[PDB]
Amino acid sequence: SSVDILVPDLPESVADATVATWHKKPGDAVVRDEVLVEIETDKVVLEVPASADGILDAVLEDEGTTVTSRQILGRLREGN
Numbered sequence: 495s496s497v498d499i500l501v502p503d504l505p506e507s508v509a510d511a512t513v514a515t516w517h518k519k520p521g522d523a524v525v526r527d528e529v530l531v532e533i534e535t536d537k538v539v540l541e542v543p544a545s546a547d548g549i550l551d552a553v554l555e556d557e558g559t560t561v562t563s564r565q566i567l568g569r570l571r572e573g574n
Contacts, residue, residue, distance in 0.1 A: 496569035497548055501533055503540035504563030511535040513567055515557040516542075516550070521571075524548035531557075531567055547571040 501511065511533045518529035528544025540563075549571030555561050556568070 495547075495572040495574065496551055497528060497544040497572055498566070498569050499529075499531070499542040499544055500566040501535075501540055501542070501561055501563050503535070503538075505535065505538055505540075507536055507538075508562050508564075509536050510560055510562045511540075513555045513557050513559050513561060514539055516553060516567075518548050518550040518553075518570060521549045521551060523571075528570075531555075533561060533567070535563060542567050544570065544572070547573060 528548035554568035
């Protein structure tokens with residue numbers, strides 16, 4: 495159980511992108527509103543709002559990693 499967050503904000507272009515910068519500390523713990531990282535889809539930076547936990551445990555896209563509209567920023571923590 496982790497923040498399985500990706501970039502499903504595919505608007506109208508798939509020229510790759512970049513995780514400008516997350517907003518979750520190492521193993522944080524949000525509640526009803528987690529981090530909202532900021533990627534780069536060519537002028538359109540989407541976000542990544544989890545919904546709880548957010549404990550940064552596995553960020554496979556640590557700010558800068560290359561990603562697009564469908565890849566995965568990484569997984570953190572979760573429950574349920």
